[PDB]
From a paper:
In all species, ribosomes synthesize proteins by faithfully decoding messenger RNA (mRNA) nucleotide sequences using aminoacyl-tRNA substrates. Here we combine single-molecule imaging and cryogenic electron microscopy methods to examine the molecular basis of human ribosome fidelity to reveal that the decoding mechanism is both kinetically and structurally distinct from that of bacteria. Although decoding is globally analogous in both species, the reaction coordinate of aminoacyl-tRNA movement is altered on the human ribosome and the process is an order of magnitude slower. These distinctions arise from eukaryote-specific structural elements in the human ribosome and in the elongation factor eukaryotic elongation factor 1A (eEF1A) that together coordinate faithful tRNA incorporation at each mRNA codon.
Decoding was stalled in intermediate-FRET states by the slowly hydrolysing GTP analogue GTPγS, as expected for GTPase-activated (GA) states. SSU domain closure in the CR-to-GA transition locally remodelled the decoding centre to structure and enclose the codon–anticodon pair, engaging the universally conserved SSU rRNA ‘monitoring’ bases G626, A1824 and A1825 (G530, A1492 and A1493 in E. coli). Solvent exposure of the codon–anticodon pair was reduced by an outer shell of additional contacts, including the N-terminal portion of eukaryote-specific ribosomal protein eS30 and neighbouring rRNA nucleotides. The codon–anticodon pair also engaged elements of the post-transcriptionally modified H69 base Am3760 (A1913 in E. coli), which shifted from being solvent exposed in the CR complex to interacting with the post-transcriptionally modified position 37 of aa-tRNA in the GA complex immediately upstream of the anticodon. Immediately downstream of the last mRNA codon base in the A site, conserved loop elements of ribosomal protein uS12, including Ser64 and post-translationally hydroxylated cis-Pro62 residues, also reached into the decoding centre to stabilize stacking of SSU shoulder domain base C614 (C518 in E. coli) with monitoring base G626 through magnesium-ion coordination. Ternary complex movement towards the decoding centre in the CR-to-GA transition docked the conserved G domain and catalytic switch-II His95 residue of eEF1A tightly against the SRL. Focused refinement with signal subtraction on eEF1A in the GA structure revealed the catalytic geometry of the G domain, including density for a water molecule poised for GTP hydrolysis, and confident modelling of the sulfur position in GTPγS. This G-domain geometry agreed with that of the EF-Tu ternary complex stalled by GDPCP. We therefore conclude that GTPase activation in human also requires uncoupled ternary complex movements towards the decoding centre and the SRL to span the increased distance created by the unrolled SSU conformation.
Numbering used by the authors:
A (entry chain SR): 2 to 135
B (entry chain Ln): 1 to 25
C (entry chain Sb): 2 to 84
D (entry chain SA): 2 to 223
E (entry chain SW): 2 to 130
F (entry chain SC): 59 to 280
G (entry chain SV): 1 to 83
H (entry chain Sa): 2 to 100
Write the structure that this text describes.
RNA sequence: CGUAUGUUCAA
RNA sequence: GACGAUCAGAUACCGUCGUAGUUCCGACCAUAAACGAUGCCGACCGGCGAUGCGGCGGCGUUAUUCCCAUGACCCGCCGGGCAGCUUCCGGGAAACCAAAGUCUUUGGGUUCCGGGGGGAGUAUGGUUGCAAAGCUGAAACUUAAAGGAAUUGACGGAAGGG
């Protein structure tokens, strides 16, 4: 019967977002931190919040979680933006097209004007999964 | 009372009534 | 499609639609010029023929009735007639 | 494109669409998306018409530009393959993005915290983002969508026929939409190719991220 | 079987009108249908229509302008005297400001207001508004 | 006092929008009762049609709640109907009045057969359906008055209709459905295409673009 | 609405759908009025003029708002005739 | 109130379907209405399959299976927990439960 | 549905004549059995002789002795 | 395996 | 029907027997929740995957030893059918229905048939039948509800989880 109520969890997640840098994996230090950065009216409540904070810190330090943490934030921007390849994936020497869209590109008056290769069309048109149960 | 048995009740009642008139004619 | 032009449908659209349901009904059948490998003369044969057409004089079967278009005898060349 | 040679499709765009597979639709066809396909391939795949893709793309761009305040344009992608593409578009054009979960009540609950009243809505997929499209119906909100061959068109006013499934094509279509919006606004030059690479709007699954980061790390160390 | 070509035509126009279609195919075609359509055309309720000749009853394609609320037939074709025309108007038309009752009279097929002007009663064909 | 939360409420308070018909013209969803109070505050008159208790069966007994039907409207082209259910009668009435104001629609009034003077009747025969109740509004000769039951007669007077013949079918004892059906009939007067509305519509500026600059200056901060 | 004199007695004149020509009612919250900006002939850049289209809620519900807008644009020259 | 569009049975374009007898109680049930269950299982249970293996006289003898087709009336199917009650919308689902 | 042909006046008249017997208000006043069976014989009032005073027990959910007379 | 019943009115 | 159980009783459910019947042929009977509880003929009105029959078209696979056609399969179209999914077509008291829609914006044609619940499908007359009965079919009198669909609870010798 050790499930923590929303009041324990709401305080603990907030403390790690707000004061992550001053927290760590030790319950005893975290317990002392909560005494000055928060007004916890009872000692038992304080030790429960510090308990969850200690549990969260391990998880927030081995991966991202519901809680936000600048260090994890500044990496998300870097992947989402910083990884622009040297050459685009679209920049391909040979682009493969089937005679169907090649004749379409002829309507696009772009057929023979491009650097593209024509594949042999697929034969048999077996593209539907067999019908039946499951 | 079930309608089917209410029908059976009346059929038996009718048969009795027809015997009562076949006896008087 | 709310605004579909019913006066001028595509020939592909008319060719798909049922012959009676076309804008102006037309048969899907036709007549043909059948030449059996023997002799030289040409026979006019209905596409959906119901009778076994015999090349008179030559006395050979030109087409066999089916549930639809008549089945031409093997070795017989046919060409669609135009009206 | 108003049959204007300045807005015609260039050979550079054609290679971009072909490379990203934007011309390949699904095996199913919506009856209201019939006018946008070209021909079914021999493997059941419907080919989307690129002229019609371009026309609707520019028609969508003209609708976006008509909104005076760029913040009044909302761009949404519930699916992850398009969350990065949408936020960039919102950074490059000043739109208000909603990536990830769309909380119901956003456009209709006046007292909700994230309550907003956009003048124009752009979504990545009508099926996935069905909540914003259905909700827009309560507040007189015109809607623009990227629709595949098998995509419903209910409450969708401008549908851009494109492969809104593949990662490359979804990002490319948002890139082309962003570029065309800026060109009409005059923010960027039209004869000069855009500085933003198309790959910046491409969603990258985690497996590729750790694969390439260690490849870059081993490249740097040696 | 088809007992009334005019009823089939007016119903077909009414359904396409409600569905927002721009054109409706009407089959088969009759002089009564064409004269009825003309009465609606002269009042702007429908656009141009093209009768199509099939060496048969005929087909028509009507251009719909999104103005009809309802084009309904009256069956059977009751005889309408001039005195009883007003009671027919109160029963068939939403208001006297608009809407017409199409009458077939000896003078010709015409709307109820033209019949009143020409002082001719007749047999009622239908209505539109 | 009134701090508007919606853009429409912001423009109304800033006196940028005049008359409800401009809001009605673009069919904007009103979401604040103060907008209605701003335009028609003095002329609106309210009436409690019915206080109908409803009960929910529970273990401990019957949970009685009170439903209030309130009809609102100035006696000149505007009428609204509001239904609210709550634990208290007084709370239900106040909530119904708010909902009644939010529901106000413009009433189109026409002429029986003259076109002399101001409009006195409904433009044409209009029917309203709610559940089994069918209420049919019929144009009436000038000087006829309102020939109806007491329930629709209150709504029709509040709509400003001066002459109207009526025809009700169904369980009119269901005052909730009876009133709603009448309200539906009145509502669709302006949804009925009379040939006088045939002339091509001229498109004006939406309030969200005509005052897009004012909204950016104020509503972003407020 | 005008009396015999010709004074406008309607409270307001409601818009009509640009495709179905139905009146857009005061409570039709699914209706839209979407502006499509017109570019300069040479620049291809918003010059300040826009085309306006109104669609009623019913057309949007049917999913026909796409072809209504597209067909309106082709009529207005926004979309090339060889679409 | 109608509960099922197909009236609880698979009869659509015919008048009469021959009945069959329930496997448990032998009640007459129409063949299209009977809850059917084609049971395939090994003659020997998985507990005893090991003992038969080294008791067998063959090096690689595959155990024959038991093919029994059961037909259940509605009462027996519900009682024997072959089928259960479902909600309003859960009833409409027709795919068999996952393996 | 109902017939509507221009020469169906007899069929419509005949049908309404038959279906008018199916509401008890019409059949009570037009069959004659009701008037024959009516103790007043179609009169508003009637005189009589009190045979005896009788008490009728009121129906549930009430309880009382209603005072009556056999006449 | 195998059991049935619950006086009248009344919130 | 007999019997054995079960039970307070058990003229039942369970079990052991078992007559009529069940079966074939010939003559009757004319009713069923004879149900899609939904008349028929005709027109219009969304989409999608199938399916059965017929025809037409088309890469390719397989047998017909090679050819030929023909079959088996694959991809479509058309027509008639049994249905299914979806839909703010529209309707409806709702359950629901692509018809139960195109209805107060009320009329394609036409047949049968209902008018609060009972009494009562009873009486009586006619008619059919070997009979059982079928068909036609009232009245006196009595009554303020009977009923439909759906909601919330409670209950269940219903299920599932605690
Ligand atoms: K009592
Ligand atoms: K079929
Ligand atoms: K219940
Ligand atoms: Mg039941
Ligand atoms: Mg059902
Ligand atoms: Mg079953
Ligand atoms: Mg009566
Ligand atoms: Mg008593
Ligand atoms: Mg009492
Ligand atoms: Mg007792
Ligand atoms: Mg007792
Ligand atoms: Mg009791
Ligand atoms: Mg009490
Ligand atoms: Mg015994
Ligand atoms: Mg036995
Ligand atoms: Mg019967
Ligand atoms: Mg049967
Ligand atoms: Mg029946
Ligand atoms: Mg017959
Ligand atoms: Mg068949
Ligand atoms: Mg009727
Ligand atoms: Mg009765
Ligand atoms: Mg008899
Ligand atoms: Mg009482
Ligand atoms: Mg019943
Ligand atoms: Zn059983």
């Amino acid at each position: 019967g050790r499930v923590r109520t929303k009041t324990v969890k709401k305080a603990a997640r907030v403390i790690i977002e707000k004061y992550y840098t001053r927290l760590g994996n030790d319950f005893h230090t975290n317990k002392r931190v909560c005494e000055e950065i928060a007004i916890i009216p009872s000692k038992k409540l304080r030790n429960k919040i510090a308990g969850y904070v200690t549990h969260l810190m391990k998880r927030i330090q081995r991966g991202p979680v519901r809680g936000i943490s600048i260090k994890l934030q500044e990496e998300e921007r870097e992947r989402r933006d910083n990884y622009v390849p040297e050459v685009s994936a679209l920049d391909q020497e040979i682009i493969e097209v089937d005679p169907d869209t090649k004749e379409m590109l002829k309507l696009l008056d772009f057929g023979s004007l491009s650097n593209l290769q024509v594949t042999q069309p697929t034969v048999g048109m077996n593209f539907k999964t067999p019908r039946g149960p499951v | 009372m079930r309608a089917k048995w209410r029908k059976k009740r009346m059929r038996r009642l009718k048969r009795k009534r027809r015997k009562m008139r076949q006896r008087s004619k | 499609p709310l605004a579909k032009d019913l006066l001028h449908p595509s020939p592909e659209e008319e060719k798909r639609k049922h012959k009676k349901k076309r804008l102006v009904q037309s048969p899907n059948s036709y007549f043909m010029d059948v030449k059996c490998p023997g002799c030289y003369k040409i026979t006019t044969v209905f596409s959906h023929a119901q009778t076994v057409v015999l090349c008179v004089g030559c006395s050979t079967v030109l087409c066999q009735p089916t549930g639809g278009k008549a089945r031409l005898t093997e070795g017989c060349s046919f060409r669609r007639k135009q009206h | 494109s108003g049959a204007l040679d300045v807005l015609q499709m260039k050979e550079e765009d054609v290679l971009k669409f072909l490379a990203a597979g934007t011309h390949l639709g699904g095996t199913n066809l919506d009856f209201q998306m019939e006018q946008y396909i070209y021909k079914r391939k021999s493997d059941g795949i419907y080919i989307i018409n690129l002229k019609r893709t371009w026309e609707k793309l520019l028609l969508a761009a003209r609708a976006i530009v008509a909104i005076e305040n760029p913040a009044d344009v909302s761009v949404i992608s519930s699916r992850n393959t398009g969350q990065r593409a949408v936020l960039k578009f919102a950074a490059a054009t000043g739109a208000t993005p909603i990536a990830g979960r769309f909380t119901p009540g956003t456009f209709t609950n006046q007292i909700q915290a994230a309550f907003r009243e956009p003048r124009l809505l752009v979504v990545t997929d009508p099926r996935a983002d069905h909540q914003p499209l259905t909700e827009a119906s309560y507040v007189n909100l015109p809607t623009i969508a990227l629709c595949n061959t098998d995509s419903p068109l209910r409450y969708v006013d401008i549908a851009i026929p494109c492969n809104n499934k593949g990662a490359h094509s979804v990002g490319l279509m948002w890139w082309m939409l962003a570029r065309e919006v800026l060109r009409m606004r005059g923010t960027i030059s039209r004869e000069h190719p855009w500085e933003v690479m198309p790959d910046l709007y491409f969603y990258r699954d985690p497996e590729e991220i750790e694969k390439e980061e260690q490849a870059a790390a081993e490249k740097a160390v040696t | 079987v088809r007992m009334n070509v005019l009823a089939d035509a007016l119903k077909s126009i009414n359904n396409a009108e409600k569905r927002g279609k721009r054109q409706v195919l009407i089959r088969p075609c009759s002089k009564v249908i064409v004269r009825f359509l003309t009465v609606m055309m002269k009042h702007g309720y429908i656009g141009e229509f093209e009768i199509i000749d099939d060496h048969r009853a005929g087909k028509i394609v009507v251009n719909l302008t999104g103005r009809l609320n309802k084009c309904g037939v009256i069956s059977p074709r009751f005889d309408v005297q001039l005195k009883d025309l007003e009671k027919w108007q109160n029963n068939l038309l939403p208001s006297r400001q608009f809407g017409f009752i199409v009458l077939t009279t000896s003078a010709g097929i015409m709307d109820h207001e033209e019949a009143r002007r020409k002082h001719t009663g007749g047999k009622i064909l239908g209505f539109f508004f | 006092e009134w701090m508007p939360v919606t853009k429409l409420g912001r423009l109304v308070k800033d006196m940028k929008i005049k008359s409800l018909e401009e809001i009605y013209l673009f069919s904007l969803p009103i979401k604040e009762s103060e907008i209605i109070d701003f335009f028609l505050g003095a002329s609106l008159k309210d009436e409690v049609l019915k206080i109908m208790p409803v009960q929910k069966q529970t273990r401990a007994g019957q949970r009685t709640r009170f439903k209030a039907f309130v009809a609102i409207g100035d006696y000149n082209g505007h009428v609204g109907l509001g239904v609210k259910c709550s634990k208290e009668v007084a709370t239900a009435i106040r909530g119904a009045i708010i909902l009644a104001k939010l529901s106000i629609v413009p009433v189109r009034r026409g002429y029986w057969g003259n076109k002399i003077g101001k409009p006195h009747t409904v433009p044409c025969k209009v029917t309203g359906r709610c559940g089994s109740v069918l209420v049919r509004l019929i144009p009436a000769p000038r000087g006829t008055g309102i020939v109806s039951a007491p329930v629709p007669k209150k709504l029709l007077m509040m709509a400003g209709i001066d002459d109207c013949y009526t025809s009700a079918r169904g369980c009119t004892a269901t005052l909730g459905n009876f009133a709603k059906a009448t309200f539906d009939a009145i509502s669709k007067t302006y949804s009925y295409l009379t040939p006088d509305l045939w002339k091509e519509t001229v498109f004006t500026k939406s309030p969200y673009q005509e005052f897009t600059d004012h909204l950016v200056k104020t509503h972003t901060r407020v | 609405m005008q009396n015999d004199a010709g004074e406008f007695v309607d409270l307001y004149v409601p818009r009509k759908c640009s495709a179905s020509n139905r009146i857009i009612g005061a409570k039709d919250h699914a209706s839209i009025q979407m502006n499509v900006a017109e570019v300069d002939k040479v620049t291809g850049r918003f010059n300040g003029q826009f085309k306006t289209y109104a669609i009623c809620g019913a057309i949007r519900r049917m999913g026909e708002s796409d072809d209504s807008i597209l067909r309106l644009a082709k009529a207005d020259g926004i979309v090339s005739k060889n679409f | 109130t109608k509960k099922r569009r197909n009236n609880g049975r698979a009869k659509k374009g015919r008048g009469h379907v021959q009945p069959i007898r329930c496997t448990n109680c032998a009640r007459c049930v129409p063949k299209d209405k009977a809850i059917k269950k084609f049971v395939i299982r090994n003659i020997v249970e998985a507990a005893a399959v090991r003992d038969i293996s080294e008791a067998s006289v063959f090096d690689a003898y595959v155990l024959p299976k038991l093919y029994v087709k059961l037909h259940y009336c509605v009462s027996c199917a519900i009682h024997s927990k072959v089928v259960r009650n479902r909600s309003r919308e859960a009833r409409k689902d027709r795919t068999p439960p996952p393996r | 549905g109902k017939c509507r042909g221009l020469r169906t006046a007899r069929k419509l008249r005949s049908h309404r004549r038959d279906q008018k017997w199916h509401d008890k208000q019409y059949k009570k006043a037009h069959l004659g059995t009701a008037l024959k069976a009516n103790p007043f014989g179609g009169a508003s009032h009637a005189k009589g002789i009190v045979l005896e005073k009788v008490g009728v027990e009121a129906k549930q959910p009430n309880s009382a002795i209603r005072k009556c007379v056999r006449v």
